[PDB]
Amino acid sequence: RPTFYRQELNKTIWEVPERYQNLSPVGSGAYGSVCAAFDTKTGLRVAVKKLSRPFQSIIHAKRTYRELRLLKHMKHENVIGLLDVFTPARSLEEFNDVYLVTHLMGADLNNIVKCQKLTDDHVQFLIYQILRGLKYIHSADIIHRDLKPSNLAVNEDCELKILDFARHHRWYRAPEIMLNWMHYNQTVDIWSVGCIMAELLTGRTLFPGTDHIDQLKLILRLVGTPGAELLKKISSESARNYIQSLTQMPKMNFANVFIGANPLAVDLLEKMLVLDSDKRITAAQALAHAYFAQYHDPDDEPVADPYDQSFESRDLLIDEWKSLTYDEVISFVPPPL
Ligand SMILES: CC(C)Cn1ncc2cc(Cc3ccc(F)cc3F)c(C(=O)NCCN(C)C)cc21
Ligand SMILES: Fc1ccc(-c2n[nH]cc2-c2ccncc2)cc1
């Protein structure tokens, strides 16, 4: 066991091993508190997240267990991974805090898009990496659910990583969630990617809606009201009525909306921003799209080992979720240096 040291940043107490030095806050919220730090054992700059009240309730305890399982499983260049997880506690009895460690990235995508407009080649490489990481995540039957510029981090090399999965198990959310459809599939993420790609090409949020209703009407204005094939798939009575009563609007021509953009980019957006989720393009299929010929390599777009999410359906006590989390802390194995 290593030796810990203690200090106060903002109003948070931080107890971490000596190897992590020069902690400086990065931000805080419901997710907990994040600090940038230097790892003397490896020489890397790292990001340390201290979970907030990890075992204060059953919802928190399960959430803590969920995040740790996910991060321990992700082993992919475009997905955030676990460098280390530790607790200052020496036993299950005193186990009360969990810290997570990962490589520090240069900036989030929301600090690039507004600082600069992106060339078509940059958009190619950035979107390509998101999809490469999404293919991996989706191969494990995991849905991110909250893909958005602030959840994508980039290095000065333009290397990208997907961060902070939505622990749910807004301008970027698929319309079937605005309609509250409880059976949305993994292509909800592909919709998010489409809204992101469009924003990089134009510099403007594609669907800057003020609420759920306003959001949907901005989406239908671009992709048009749903056809009869999609009408036949809606079970909700209120939804069906709301949609059949809206003044009908045609699908606009993306080539005209996105004038001057690479025609291969326009084509990909049209395959991503499809209202009917069954017809939306998949991450695996989008990687083979001609827009990414510069970067596509079918022997270097790997898939993930099978991920067991059976715990999601379990109804346990706080002490049981806590103990299961402790087990995952102890059995952690750092990645090969
Ligand atoms: C913006 C730069 C600091 C780039 N950067 N690089 C790595 C990294 C990790 C995090 C969060 C995080 C996740 C796993 C982990 F084990 C340790 C962690 F710290 C955050 C962050 O602060 N996320 C806040 C939550 N928001 C986005 C919803 C930011 C990160
Ligand atoms: F206006 C819309 C927008 C999106 C959808 C939709 N796309 N994929 C699945 C659905 C959907 C929505 C609600 N109920 C069932 C299915 C249906 C109508």
Author numbering: 5 to 173, 186 to 353
What text appears in the publication on this structure?
Compounds 94 and 95 showed balanced submicromolar inhibitory potency against hBChE and p38α MAPK, while they did not inhibit AChE at a concentration of 100 μM, which was also one of the main objectives to diminish potential side effects. Compounds 94 and 95 showed high selectivity for p38α MAPK. The KINOMEscan assay showed that off-target inhibition was limited only to structurally related kinases (p38β MAPK, JNK1/2/3, and CDK3) and was absent at 1 μM, where only p38α MAPK was inhibited among the 103 kinases tested. The bulky isobutyl and cyclohexylmethyl groups occupy HR II, delineated by Val30, Ile108, Gly110, Ala111, and Asp112. The 2,4-difluorobenzene sits in HR I defined by Ala51, Lys53, Leu75, Ile84, Leu104, Thr106, and Leu167. The optimal distance of 7.9 Å between the hydrogen bond donor on the indazole core (i.e., the N 2 nitrogen of the indazole) and the 2,4-difluorobenzyl group allows exquisite selectivity toward the structurally and phylogenetically most related kinases. The amide group is critical for effective inhibition of p38α MAPK as it acts as a hydrogen bond donor interacting with Asp168 of the DFG pocket (3.2 Å for compound 94 and 3.6 Å for compound 95). The tertiary amine (i.e., the dimethylamine group) faces the solvent, which explains the retention of p38α MAPK inhibition when this functional group was not present. The brain-to-serum AUC ratio was 1.58 for compound 94 and 0.83 for compound 95, indicating a higher brain penetration of compound 94.
Inhibition of butyrylcholinesterase (BChE) and p38α mitogen-activated protein kinase (p38α MAPK) offers an innovative dual approach to mitigate two major drivers of neurodegeneration in AD: cholinergic deficit and neuroinflammation. Using structure-based drug design and a library of known p38α MAPK inhibitors, we developed first-in-class, selective dual BChE/p38α MAPK inhibitors with balanced activity against both targets. The X-ray crystal structures of the two most promising molecules bound to both enzymes were solved. Structure-based design of MTDLs that simultaneously inhibit p38α MAPK and hBChE led to the identification and subsequent optimization of the first dual inhibitors of these two AD-related target enzymes.
